[PDB]
C-alpha cells in the first residue's frame, strides 16, 4: 500500500564550490582546468621548419648555421635556444621587431641585388668567425667591401637596388665598426666614413664606431645590421665611401605562419593548436594552468590548480 520516491547516491562523492557553499558534495564532477602538457611539439597537419641552431635573423644575412634555411615555405616556424644569428660579432638595430616579422611569416624568397664593384674595391672580405668547409668565409647574403690597396682610400661608391616585383622586399646591410684606427685605415683609408642609405620612404646615415672592445669569437671589430622595407616600384640607393657591408641579395617574406620558441622535440604523429616553451597543449578544456606564455589557439591561463564542474546532483549518502 506504499510507494516511495527517491534519487541515487554514492559511497564517496566529490567536493565542488557553489555560490553559497565551498564544500558541496555531489555525486559526480569533472575538471575544467588542464594540468597536463605533452612535452613534444605536435606537428601533425603542419608544414614546419625547425631552425636547429639557426636564428631567424641568420636566415636573412646568411650565417653558416642557416645555410639550409636561406629560402623556404612553412606554416609553422620553430626557433631553438642558443641559435646563431651572428658568426661575426654584432647586433641588428630593432632586432626584436625583425625577429617577430620573420616569425609571423610563412616563407622567405631571395632576390639578387646585382651590386657590382669597381676594381679598386675588394668584395671578397672574409673572417675566421664565419667558417664554411674549414675556411674563412662570410655571410652568404652579404659582401664585406674593403679597399683593394691596403691603406689607400676607399672611393665614393653608389649602389642602387630596384624593386621590380609586385610586393615589398626586405633589405639588410651592415656597418663595420673597427677595433682600432689602424685597422680602420688598412681597410678603408683616412677619410671620414659616411654611409647614406635612401629610398623614397626611408633615409638614414651611418658613422662607423672605431674603438677598442672585447674579443667575441676572436674578433674585437663589430658588424651591426640595419633593415628597411622597399615597396614595389621603389629604388633604394647606397651612397657609401667605406665600412658598408652591402647586400648581395634581398629577402621577400611570403604569407603567414606561426612562430614557436621551444626546445621540445618535434612529433609528427600528434596534432595540436596550442604551443608553449615546454611543448603542446591539446585539450578540449577552456582553461589551462601550465603557462602564461602560449602561442596559437589556446585555453586561457588561470591561477588555479583545479576547478570541478558538478556533473550530478547533491550526494546525500545512506
Amino acid at each position: 500500500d506504499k510507494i516511495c520516491l527517491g534519487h541515487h547516491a554514492v559511497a564517496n562523492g566529490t567536493i565542488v564550490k557553489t555560490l553559497t557553499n565551498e564544500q558541496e558534495e555531489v555525486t559526480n564532477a569533472t575538471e575544467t582546468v588542464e594540468s597536463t602538457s605533452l612535452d613534444r611539439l605536435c606537428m601533425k597537419g603542419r608544414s614546419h621548419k625547425d631552425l636547429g641552431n639557426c636564428h631567424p635573423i641568420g636566415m636573412l644575412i646568411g650565417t653558416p648555421a642557416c645555410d639550409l634555411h636561406l629560402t623556404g615555405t612553412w606554416d609553422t616556424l620553430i626557433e631553438r635556444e642558443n641559435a646563431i644569428a651572428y658568426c661575426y660579432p654584432g647586433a641588428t638595430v630593432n632586432e626584436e621587431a625583425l625577429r617577430q616579422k620573420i616569425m609571423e611569416s610563412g616563407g622567405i624568397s631571395k632576390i639578387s641585388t646585382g651590386f657590382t664593384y669597381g676594381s679598386s674595391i675588394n668584395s671578397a672580405g672574409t673572417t675566421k668567425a664565419c667558417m664554411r668547409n674549414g675556411g674563412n668565409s662570410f655571410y652568404a647574403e652579404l659582401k664585406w667591401l674593403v679597399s683593394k690597396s691596403k691603406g689607400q682610400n676607399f672611393p665614393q661608391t653608389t649602389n642602387t637596388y630596384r624593386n621590380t616585383d609586385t610586393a615589398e622586399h626586405l633589405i639588410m646591410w651592415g656597418i663595420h665598426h673597427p677595433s682600432s684606427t689602424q685597422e680602420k685605415n688598412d681597410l678603408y683609408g683616412t677619410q671620414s666614413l659616411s654611409i647614406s642609405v635612401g629610398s623614397s620612404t626611408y633615409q638614414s646615415n651611418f658613422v662607423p664606431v672605431v674603438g677598442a672592445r672585447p674579443q667575441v669569437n676572436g674578433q674585437s671589430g663589430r658588424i651591426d645590421f640595419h633593415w628597411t622595407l622597399v615597396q614595389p616600384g621603389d629604388n633604394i640607393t647606397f651612397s657609401h665611401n667605406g665600412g658598408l657591408i652591402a647586400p648581395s641579395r634581398v629577402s621577400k617574406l611570403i604569407g603567414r605562419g606561426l612562430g614557436i620558441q621551444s626546445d621540445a622535440p618535434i612529433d609528427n604523429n600528434c596534432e595540436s593548436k596550442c604551443f608553449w616553451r615546454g611543448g603542446s597543449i591539446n585539450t578540449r578544456l577552456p582553461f589551462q594552468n601550465l603557462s602564461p606564455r602560449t602561442v596559437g589557439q589556446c585555453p586561457k591561463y588561470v591561477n588555479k590548480k583545479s576547478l570541478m564542474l558538478a556533473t550530478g546532483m547533491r550526494n546525500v549518502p545512506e
Partner: protein
C-alpha cells in the same frame, strides 16, 4: 536546497539505485521492489550534457608571441606586457571561478527540481487515492499490487478504478 526535495523532505539518496538517477521503491502484499524513472533521469542528464557541450566549444583566436623565451626584452615594454598579461589572467581566473560556482549552483537546483517534478506528477497521478507522508512516499488507501505499481511508474495509472475503495479507507 531551492526546490525542497533533494536534501530536503526526501531524507537520503539510494546507493542501491545504480541503473538511474530518480526512482521508485514500493511495498505491498507481494514484498518490495525498486525501479528507475527514465524520463526524469534523461531530462537531467541531457541538461548536464548541454553544459559540457558549452564548456568545450573552441574560440579560434590565434595569438602570436609578444615575449621572447630566448632573448632579453626591453625593460619598459616588458613591464607593460607583464602588467597586461597579469591583468588578463586575473580576469580569466575570476571568470573561471564564477562560471563554475554558478554552474554548480544551477545543476544542483535543476536536479532538485527534476525530483520535485517527478514527485508532483505522481501526486496528481494518484489524485484522491493516496496521501503524502512528508518523506517522499505516498500511502495508497487501497490494494495496489505489482501490476498497479508498474502503472504508476509507467504513468498509466487510472484513479477512477480505485476511487471508491480508496475513499472508504480514507474515511475509515
Amino acid at each position: 536546497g531551492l526546490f525542497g526535495a533533494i536534501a530536503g523532505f526526501i531524507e537520503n539518496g539510494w546507493e542501491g539505485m545504480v541503473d538511474g538517477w530518480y526512482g521508485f521503491r514500493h511495498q505491498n502484499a507481494q514484498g518490495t521492489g525498486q525501479a528507475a524513472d527514465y524520463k526524469s533521469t534523461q531530462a537531467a542528464i541531457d541538461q548536464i550534457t548541454g553544459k559540457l557541450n558549452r564548456l568545450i566549444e573552441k574560440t579560434n583566436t590565434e595569438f602570436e608571441s609578444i615575449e621572447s623565451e630566448f632573448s632579453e626584452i626591453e625593460h619598459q615594454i616588458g613591464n607593460v606586457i607583464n602588467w597586461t598579461k597579469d591583468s588578463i589572467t586575473d580576469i580569466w581566473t575570476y571568470q573561471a571561478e564564477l562560471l563554475v560556482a554558478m554552474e554548480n549552483q544551477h545543476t544542483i537546483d535543476m536536479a532538485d527540481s527534476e525530483m520535485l517534478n517527478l514527485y508532483e506528477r505522481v501526486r496528481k497521478q494518484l489524485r484522491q487515492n493516496a496521501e503524502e507522508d512528508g518523506k517522499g512516499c505516498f500511502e495508497i488507501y487501497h490494494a495496489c499490487d505489482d501490476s498497479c505499481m508498474e502503472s504508476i511508474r509507467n504513468n498509466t495509472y487510472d484513479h477512477s478504478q480505485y476511487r471508491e475503495e480508496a475513499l472508504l479507507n480514507r474515511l475509515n
